[PDB]
């Protein structure tokens, strides 16, 4: 739930704030891995409901039923640090 919301956060924040969040999710992916891997693989997406963005609770949203699509905007972000930061996360994902 936080991983999906944090990519949404990274989309619309100043360059340094976006870079900081990008680095944070790099550690989150590295430390946990398979717990969040299905978010970046469309075949492993759950099919037991629909994603609820504006849920009142963390578990109320169904976050394993969605896919992280924000990489297609952050790859064309104006800040080279953000672009390198995004590439850092996928490099960790590909090494999972």
């Amino acid at each position: 739930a936080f991983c999906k919301q944090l990519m949404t956060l990274a989309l619309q924040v100043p360059e340094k704030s976006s870079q900081a969040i990008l680095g944070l999710l790099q550690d989150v992916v590295h430390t946990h891995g398979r717990k969040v891997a299905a978010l970046w693989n469309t075949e492993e997406r759950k099919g037991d409901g629909t994603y609820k963005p504006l849920s009142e609770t963390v578990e109320g949203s169904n976050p394993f039923t969605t896919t992280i699509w924000e990489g297609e905007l952050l790859r064309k972000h104006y800040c080279p640090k953000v672009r390198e930061g995004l590439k850092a996360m996928e490099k960790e994902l590909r090494s999972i």
Partner: peptide, 20 residues
């Protein structure tokens, strides 16, 4: 690692990356 390094307050001064 990276989260701690970017969490320190002296990362967000405001220095432009043209005046290095």
């Amino acid at each position: 690692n990276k989260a701690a390094e970017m969490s320190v307050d002296d990362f967000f001064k405001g220095g432009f990356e043209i005046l290095s």
